[PDB]
Amino acid sequence: VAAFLKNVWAKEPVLVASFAIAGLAVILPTLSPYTKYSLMINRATPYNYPVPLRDDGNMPDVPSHPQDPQGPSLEWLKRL
Amino acid sequence: VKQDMPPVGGYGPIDYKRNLPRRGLSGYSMFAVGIGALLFGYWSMMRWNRERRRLQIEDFEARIALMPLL
């Protein structure tokens, strides 16, 4: 496959470069470690209003104040 | 007598062949320079885009805090 690659690199290097960039752009995001970081970065953007919920008295996760430790934090993007 | 004559020693050598210099770096050098510039730009854009996302999140949470009075 080396002779064929040398031949196409000698004839038209633009096609070889374009196909190399296309293959890199295809196979690298499937091997990327920061794609899930992009997922939570997009998911953590506060576009609309975070409306509260009614209380039946049984909820261990949601807080009553924004500064309470209960609830999700955003420390991972602050450090990164 | 006096007449138009070349001198006693004659005229000097005159260059008449092609002389191209042949100059610049090797192609590996410009390829490495371009790749390094690409990597540096990618890193700087990465850092500044992350900072911009943080600032946008801060502005959005300020907007969310300001909403109920409006």
Ligand SMILES: CCCCCCCCCCCCCCCCCC(=O)OC[C@H](COP(=O)([O-])OCC[N+](C)(C)C)OC(=O)CCCCCCCCCCCCCCCCC
């Ligand atoms: C905007 C900022 C300033 C820009 C520079 C301004 C000053 C310099 C201006 C120079 C003169 C420009 C006008 C005259 C020329 C007009 C014609 C022209 O441009 O023809 C285009 C010429 C035409 O080529 P050609 O004329 O040789 O065509 C012959 C074609 N074959 C060989 C098939 C017979 O080149 C191209 O079309 C190539 C496009 C640009 C390539 C850029 C490559 C960037 C790096 C890619 C990756 C490389 C690494 C390897 C892969 C790695 C993968 C991970």
